Structures are given as structure tokens and as C-alpha cells.
Amino acid sequence: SEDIIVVALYDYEAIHHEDLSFQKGDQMVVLEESGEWWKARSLATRKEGYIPSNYVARVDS
């Protein structure tokens, strides 16, 4: 029973309305699945926005 939580493997700063700045070793949950831009919620701040999946890793935690 996996889930849609990913981890940011590199630092990234937001740049839009529902954007999200994560870090090189951050953890975020995904709210929906899409192309390379996934919408997730950063648990470190309970916020949520976009995150380039090309520099992230999907996991069930």
C-alpha cells in the first residue's frame, strides 16, 4: 500500500502562485499527479505548491 509522498533531493525556490520552495533533503506529500510539475504539500510548513519532479524522488512515506 504505497502512497504519493516524495523527497526533494535538491534545493528549489518557488516562482508562482501555488508554488513551493523545498530543500535538498526535504519531504513532501503529493496532492495530485501530473507531468513533471507535481503539486505537493511541504510537511515542514504544512504548505503546498508545485515541485519539479525532475529533481525529486517518489515514495510511500
List keywords for this structure.
0% helix, 61 residues, SH3 type barrels, mainly beta, 5-stranded antiparallel β-sheet
Structural class: mainly beta
The side-by-side strand order for the widest beta sheet comes to: 4-3-2-1-5
Q: Which term fits the overall shape? A: globular
Major sheet attributes = 5 strands, antiparallel
CATH level-two architecture: Roll
Family: Belongs to the protein kinase superfamily. Tyr protein kinase family. SRC subfamily.
Subcellular location: Cytoplasmic vesicle, Secretory vesicle; Cytoplasm, Cytosol
Organism: Homo sapiens (Human)
Protein name: Tyrosine-protein kinase HCK
Give a description of the structure.
By secondary structure, this protein is mainly beta. The chain has a single domain (1-61), classed as SH3 type barrels (Roll). Helix content is 0%, strand content 44%. The chain is built from no helices and five strands. It has strands at 5-8, 26-32, 37-42, 47-52, 56-59. Strands 4-3-2-1-5 form a five-stranded antiparallel sheet, with no helix packed on it. It is globular, with a radius of gyration of 10 Å. The termini are close together.
Question: Helices and strands in order, then pairings?
Answer:
Elements: E1 5-8, E2 26-32, E3 37-42, E4 47-52, E5 56-59
Antiparallel strand pairs: 1-2, 1-5, 2-3, 3-4
Q: Would you kindly provide a brief summary of this structure?
A:
The chain has about 60 residues and is an all-beta fold.
